[PDB]
A paper describes a structure:
Changes in the spike (S) glycoprotein in these variants are under scrutiny because the S protein has a central role in engaging the angiotensin-converting enzyme 2 (ACE2) receptor to mediate cellular entry and is a dominant target of neutralizing antibodies (nAbs) elicited by either vaccination or natural infection. The prefusion SARS-CoV-2 S trimer is composed of S1 and S2 subunits separated by a furin cleavage site. The S1 subunit contains the N-terminal domain (NTD), ACE2 receptor binding domain (RBD), and two subdomains (SD1 and SD2). The RBD transitions between a “closed” (“down”) receptor-inaccessible conformation and an “open” (“up”) conformation that allows binding to the ACE2 receptor.
The B.1.1.7 variant emerged in the UK in September 2020 and spread worldwide, with reports of increased transmissibility, virulence, and mortality. B.1.1.7 spike affinity for ACE2 was improved over the D614G spike by a factor of ~5 as a result of the N501Y substitution. Multiple populations of the 3-RBD-down and RBD-up states were identified, with a higher proportion of RBD-up particles observed for the B.1.1.7 spike (~1.8:1 RBD-up/RBD-down) relative to the D614G spike (~0.8:1) and the mink-associated ΔFV spike (~1.3:1). We identified several RBD-up structures, including a typical 1-RBD-up state and two 1-RBD-up populations with the up RBD and its adjacent NTD disordered. We next sought to understand how variations that are distal from the RBD/NTD region influence the B.1.1.7 spike conformational distribution. These variations spanned multiple domains including SD1 [Ala570 → Asp (A570D)], SD2 [Pro681 → His (P681H)], HR1 [Ser982 → Ala (S982A)], CD [Asp1118 → His (D1118H)], and the linker between SD2 and fusion peptide [Thr716 → Ile (T716I)]. By contrast, the T716I substitution abrogated an intraprotomer hydrogen bond (H-bond) between the Thr716 side-chain and Gln1071 main-chain carbonyls, suggesting a local destabilizing effect. The A570D substitution resulted in an interprotomer H-bond with the Asn856 side chain, reinforcing the stacking of the SD1 loop against the HR1 helix of the adjacent protomer. The HR1 S982A substitution, on the other hand, resulted in the loss of an interprotomer H-bond between the Ser982 and Thr547 side chains. Thus, the S982A mutation appears to disable a latch that modulates the RBD up/down equilibrium, thereby increasing RBD up propensity. In B.1.1.7, amino acid substitutions that destabilize the 3-RBD-down or closed state to favor RBD-up or open states are balanced by substitutions that stabilize the prefusion spike conformation.
Residue numbers in the entry:
A (entry chain B): 27 to 66, 81 to 143, 164 to 172, 186 to 242, 263 to 300
B (entry chain B): 696 to 811, 813 to 827, 854 to 1140
C (entry chain A): 301 to 483, 485 to 620, 641 to 676, 690 to 745
D (entry chain A): 944 to 1091
E (entry chain C): 548 to 597
F (entry chain C): 944 to 992
The structure:
């Protein structure tokens, strides 16, 4: 199954405050009106980066696995979130698609339908970034036509090679970032309020 | 494929003339830019700013920063000159009487409102529709908008109370209806055509000023000629300031980061790439501002000529002071420019008549002294050519020249001898 | 001095830029106190083979780079995009220390934008490298009896390495039609060894290499030089340095609504408008100290040696004294009369030398007049005056021409 | 009195004095004097020092020519205005307000000046006005009369 | 250099070896073997028109 | 008679011919041909030329 992303997946592109200005930026962004996949499970490719979103009510989704092999020979990144802690760990893990049946030469460790949770995963320069947003919505969870920007959670210097990922278990959406130029509307009190995807159509290229 | 206009076969023949039965007073609007914003750039503060290291390298290029700052200073001082050439033409600050007995013509929309700058109602419509650390500075004009409004007020008060006379010497008073009768007489329409139609002519003028007020309140798109002078200067400055962020092949575009990261022998090699590119960036801007200032000077010299010839006078130059035969025009100020409200006579309801070059009386050819011979079916009359008023053909309305035999198209008719 | 003459005609002349100078100087570095673990690299037991170079990430420490660059031990210490003398004043988001051994001739290949066997098959630096390459002879350590074969390089590959690409693969290379087959004629095992012997000639002797790669982003620092922080000063004009962001300005308390991840702010022209103090959750607005043009207002020097000074756009509280809208005007007396404009100052103000001293006044547009208008009054000239008025127009310039080859190259 | 003609002389002098002074600038070479560089250095290094002088001197001369092209168009506008004044004002009698001096124009006379022209504009200016009552028309035997 | 050389009446003080003018030009020189002051002038030049 | 119109046509043709002929100039580089510089020289040297 598939869905229209509308204008979802915009994020704050740098750690710089701006107000009452239009900023034009090139980065890995989810293209406007892009064709996102929908799911109940499987391992998926990661490409240049992932936009991910889910139905925040039943709280069944708890984390992710990222890597190449997902089972030995080389490291994989594991993320798990529960009521007391977010935990992030990097190891030569040998689990199947359910490390929570338990839970390996570890090299890094770190600790910290009514609602829509949105995430961006990106692996470039200073390696793995996470951005997110959590907001209330009307009961049809079909990626609403409004606008909001994802804010950085963490920025991890881990140096890992990622080509595939999988969810740890509700329904969820997946889309892929692309090298794209955006014009961002920072309105007042630091806040991004609108954007133009400059390559979407000739009118956006004119704007 | 664009349309050039509607086609019109004119009904020409060797003996037909069309003469207008009636007229419309037309009030056309013309907008002209006169001056720019007086922006000036410090070449050393733009290229370097704070840095002694960059400043000492910029001295190796010699006169260029004095030559650029001299050029922008010449453009800035000329904007005050352009504004003096247009508005400061009146010798004395004339004032209208407190009693508005102008023969039915109503100037309330173009004279000052003293309750307010003390601008007119139309000057406030015109002022509403138009809208620091990189070495850039914006200087104020010499005349404030309140001083420009005092000049347009004095020019307008002189025009209404004294005709063209205030442009030729001391203002000599004349009643406004008698001034309008001489502006009619100056376009070849006889004085009685005003005095016999004075309430119609006054109502057509008052109505046409109401259409200007409504049009200027309705849309900003008319003042695009002034707004483009703001937009061209803004795009030039936005480009000049963006060019500070360019590397030009230096390790960074931030002069303090070069100075914080490198020792002199390496820093001076990186800084000279920024000096070279920033100097070329400023030389390009001053060159295009010198060429743009010459275009605004030409428009200020045109506006100064339109004020002498259209406002202080009555131009006979076709389409110089609006379409139709020029009666008079009125100056209204606008930000960075001037607006002329051109009052013109437009003939409105033509009728066809049979016509002849001369008439035969007692074997001699009579020609019209002023006007045209026209025939109303069976009868012959003489008229002024710009408004139908059929006079009887008489020995006073006509002059003789020789026998009937020479003229092509002459007609046999009686001449009355009073 | 500005006009390059001993005589000045009546006028208003630009002569200088006025500036407030900084009254104090500040350094503002983060709360960190432990020395960076450089000794774990420069005094390591051995480094890897150059085809398999070893990277350590350095963070969250003070880096006294003088401990490195003062030492006579280093047979090479080159820097790119920075000077080694300057590193103790800088701050970096991360530092990556890369380590390996190569022969003394091949050290030339460890530089930005090179091509060659080591540069393109073993360790490639980027074109816009910021960092330092540090190397020393290691024949006393890495060379051994009968030769040391623990040190290797890749001699053959399908394609050249990208900057900081790493490739430890042992797979057979193919130089012709011959398939690799785990072996042959025009097919090769791609890895080779120096065999370092203590008797080798100095170009074939081993050199230890450490490359330090520095990154400075729109981000916090985590490695800083040992330069001590100092007390913050506000509302004065100050010279400052927050995490290596050197500048000058008035620092104010400010109410910019920074989100928790935003480390500094930018104006509409990308100038840095505000910063977060690296020792407090305090947001400081950076405003430039007062500056602007200075214009000197003078009668002719043939008339008086008095002058008045206009500080353009400047406010008189922050430089007789008079606040025009053109700027603060000093040495000209304000007057309640109005006169024809003599020297034009701007925004309706002019100045003149009168009963004597310099005065400044609102200009007069002309004599006030009321025309005696009535609906039945005319006025007619009883007489006339034949007037002759001179008008002068320029028509031509001097016909200059220049031999551009003789101007530029002087014969 | 002739400040317009003297201003055109002064601008051409300031432009040439600036062009000449820019021969004394280094532009980042080891000397501003082209004969020093060739008396001190061999071709391989002298070509590096000389190309800095070529680059700065060519930019110095392109700046002068561009400003003389812009200044000549301002003189051509004044010469086309002076040519129009001689036709309409000297060879004729102008009816254009302010074109040929203040007052109603009678005639004007050309006199030559260095790099310019002077027009002596002769005009009728009215004087000594007196008031009088006025009327638009007069009633005779019921007929309304207007002045010719 | 290249130029015409002539006598001059330039009043060089005892410490002055050469004179200058604003084109970066040496305008005059003291001869080192016989301390007279020489004017330097460009050899005659100009455009050619056909 | 029509020399004013032909002069305006000739000036625009001469300015374009001059703009295009300036592609053959070296400006101090080893060659005026952009591919030839990249064929002769390695990255850091070619980019300065
Ligand atoms: C693209 O979007 C349309 C409309 O939602 C959908 O039918 C189609 O299957 C999508 N195709 C792919 C390859 O995602
Ligand atoms: C899960 O919850 C337990 C509660 O005791 C806590 O110890 C742990 O840190 C949490 N996170 C993970 C990934 O186990
Ligand atoms: C990451 O691992 C995959 C495994 O198939 C490999 O193809 C790829 O070359 C690796 N990434 C990089 C940047 O080399
Ligand atoms: C931020 O700006 C928006 C503008 O709509 C306003 O609603 C909000 O109250 C502002 N926040 C603060 C802290 O003033
Ligand atoms: C002339 O036009 C006016 C309106 O402009 C109209 O009222 C009047 O009747 C017309 N007169 C004739 C003779 O057509
Ligand atoms: C003049 O015109 C205005 C606007 O229509 C009107 O309010 C005013 O009463 C008029 N004055 C006279 C004396 O008719
Ligand atoms: C004048 O005559 C022509 C030809 O008869 C006719 O087409 C036209 O409509 C007439 N115009 C008027 C105003 O009567
Ligand atoms: C004008 O012509 C009509 C016929 O078209 C005629 O009835 C009338 O009498 C003529 N006018 C005069 C004053 O005779
Ligand atoms: C005009 O009158 C003359 C003399 O009576 C006569 O010869 C001629 O034929 C007449 N022409 C017309 C058109 O009536
Ligand atoms: C920084 O260190 C000082 C003591 O040197 C301490 O009082 C202050 O709370 C620290 N601030 C932060 C943000 O760590
Ligand atoms: C000058 O500064 C003072 C102090 O801030 C202020 O009261 C005054 O209004 C300012 N005046 C102008 C014209 O800037
Ligand atoms: C007109 O003026 C002249 C001087 O210009 C004077 O001699 C003459 O008497 C005046 N005439 C009248 C009627 O005032
Ligand atoms: C004309 O009348 C007015 C008002 O009575 C008066 O001021 C003026 O002096 C009179 N004389 C002249 C020559 O204008
Ligand atoms: C040589 O040079 C000196 C310079 O002072 C001069 O006095 C002398 O006459 C010259 N000739 C000889 C033969 O010394």
């Amino acid at each position: 199954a598939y869905t229209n992303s509308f204008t979802r997946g915009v994020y704050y592109p740098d750690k710089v405050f701006r107000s009452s200005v239009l900023h034009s930026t090139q980065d890995l962004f989810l293209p406007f009106f892009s064709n996102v996949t929908w799911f109940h499970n499987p391992v998926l490719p990661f490409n240049d980066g992932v936009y991910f979103a889910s139905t925040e009510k039943s709280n069944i989704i708890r984390g992710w696995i990222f890597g190449t092999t997902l089972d030995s020979k080389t490291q994989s990144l594991l993320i798990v979130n529960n009521a007391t802690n977010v935990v992030i760990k990097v190891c030569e893990f040998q689990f199947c698609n359910d490390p929570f049946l338990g839970v390996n030469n570890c090299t890094f460790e770190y600790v910290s339908f009514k609602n829509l949770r949105e995430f961006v995963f990106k692996n470039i320069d200073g390696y793995f970034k996470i951005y997110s947003k959590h907001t209330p919505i009307n009961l049809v969870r079909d990626l609403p036509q409004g606008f909001s920007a994802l804010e950085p959670l963490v920025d991890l210097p881990i140096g890992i090679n990622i080509t595939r990922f999988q969810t740890l278990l509700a329904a969820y959406y997946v889309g892929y970032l692309q090298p794209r130029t955006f014009l961002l509307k920072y309105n007042e009190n630091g806040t991004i309020t609108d954007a133009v995807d400059c390559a979407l159509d000739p009118l956006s290229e004119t704007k | 494929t664009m349309s050039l206009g509607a086609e019109n076969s004119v009904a020409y023949s060797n003996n037909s003339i069309a003469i207008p039965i009636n007229f419309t007073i037309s009030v056309t609007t013309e907008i002209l830019p006169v001056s720019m914003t007086k922006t000036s750039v410090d070449c050393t503060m733009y290229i370097c700013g704070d840095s002694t290291e960059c400043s000492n390298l910029l001295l190796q290029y010699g006169s260029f920063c004095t030559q650029l700052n001299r050029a922008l200073t010449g453009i800035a001082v000329e904007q005050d000159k352009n504004t003096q050439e247009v508005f400061a033409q009146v010798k004395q600050i004339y004032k209208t009487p407190p009693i508005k007995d102008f023969g039915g013509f109503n100037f309330s929309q173009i004279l000052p409102d003293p309750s307010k700058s003390k601008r007119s109602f139309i000057e406030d419509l015109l002022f509403n529709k138009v809208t620091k650390f990189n070495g850039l500075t914006v200087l104020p004009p010499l005349l404030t908008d309140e001083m420009i409004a005092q000049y347009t007020s004095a020019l307008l008060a002189g025009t209404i109370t004294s005709g063209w006379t205030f442009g030729a010497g001391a203002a000599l008073q004349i009643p406004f209806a008698m001034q309008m009768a001489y502006r009619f007489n100056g376009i070849g329409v006889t004085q009685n055509v005003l005095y016999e139609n004075q309430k119609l002519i006054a109502n057509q003028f008052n109505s046409a000023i109401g259409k200007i007020q409504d049009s200027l309140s309705s849309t900003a798109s008319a003042l695009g000629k002034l707004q483009d002078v703001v937009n061209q200067n803004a795009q030039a400055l936005n480009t000049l300031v963006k060019q500070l962020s360019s590397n030009f092949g230096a390790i960074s575009s931030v002069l303090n980061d070069i100075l914080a990261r490198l020792d002199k022998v390496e820093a001076e090699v990186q800084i000279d790439r920024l000096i070279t590119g920033r100097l070329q960036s400023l030389q390009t801007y001053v060159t295009q501002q010198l060429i743009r200032a010459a275009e605004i000077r030409a428009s200020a010299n045109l506006a100064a000529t339109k004020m002498s010839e259209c406002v202080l006078g009555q131009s006979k130059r076709v389409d110089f002071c609006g379409k139709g035969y020029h009666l008079m025009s009125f100056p209204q100020s606008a930000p960075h420019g001037v607006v002329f409200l051109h009052v013109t006579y437009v003939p409105a309801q033509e009728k066809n008549f049979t016509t002849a070059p001369a008439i035969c009386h007692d074997g001699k050819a009579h020609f019209p002294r002023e006007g045209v011979f026209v025939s109303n079916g069976t009868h012959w009359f003489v008229t002024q050519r710009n408004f139908y008023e059929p006079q009887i053909i008489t020995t006073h309305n006509t002059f003789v020249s020789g026998n009937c035999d020479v003229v092509i198209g002459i007609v046999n008719n009686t001449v009355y001898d009073p | 001095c500005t006009l390059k003459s001993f005589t000045v005609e009546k006028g208003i002349y630009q002569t200088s830029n006025f500036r407030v100078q900084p009254t104090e100087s500040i350094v503002r570095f983060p709360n960190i106190t432990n020395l960076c673990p450089f000794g774990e690299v420069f005094n390591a037991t051995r480094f890897a083979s150059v085809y398999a170079w070893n990277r350590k990430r350095i963070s969250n420490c003070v880096a006294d780079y003088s401990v490195l660059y003062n030492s006579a031990s280093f047979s090479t210490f080159k820097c790119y995009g920075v000077s080694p003398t300057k590193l103790n004043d800088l701050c970096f988001t991360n530092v990556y220390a890369d380590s390996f051994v190569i022969r003394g001739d091949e050290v030339r290949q460890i530089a930005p934008g090179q091509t060659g066997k080591i540069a393109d098959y073993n360790y490639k630096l980027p074109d816009d490298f910021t960092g330092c390459v540090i190397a020393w002879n290691s024949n006393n350590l890495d060379s051994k009896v009968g030769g040391n074969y623990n040190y290797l390089y890749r001699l053959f590959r399908k394609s050249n390495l990208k900057p900081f690409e790493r490739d430890i693969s042992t797979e057979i290379y193919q130089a012709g039609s011959t398939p690799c087959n785990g072996v042959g004629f025009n097919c090769y095992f791609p890895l080779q060894s120096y065999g370092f012997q203590p008797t080798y000639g100095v170009g074939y002797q081993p050199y230890r290499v450490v490359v330090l790669s520095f990154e400075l982003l729109h981000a916090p620092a985590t490695v800083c030089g040992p330069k001590k922080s100092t007390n913050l000063v506000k509302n004065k004009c100050v010279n400052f340095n927050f995490n290596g962001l050197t500048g000058t300005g008035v620092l104010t308390e400010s109410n910019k609504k920074f989100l928790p991840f935003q480390q500094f702010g930018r104006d509409i022209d990308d100038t840095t408008d505000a910063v977060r103090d690296p020792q407090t959750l305090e947001i400081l607005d950076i405003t430039p100290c007062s500056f602007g043009g200075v214009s000197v207002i003078t009668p002719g020097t043939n008339t008086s040696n008095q002058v008045a000074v206009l500080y353009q756009g400047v406010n008189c509280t922050e430089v007789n004294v008079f606040q025009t809208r053109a700027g603060c005007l000093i040495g000209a007396e304000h007057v309640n009369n109005s006169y024809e404009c003599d020297i034009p100052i701007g925004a309706g103000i002019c100045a003149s030398y009168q009963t004597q001293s310099i005065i400044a006044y609102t200009m007069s547009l002309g004599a006030e007049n009321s025309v005696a208008y009535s609906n039945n009054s005319i006025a007619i000239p009883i007489n006339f005056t034949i007037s002759v008025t001179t008008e002068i127009l320029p028509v031509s310039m001097t016909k200059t021409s220049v031999d551009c080859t003789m101007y530029i190259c002087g014969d």
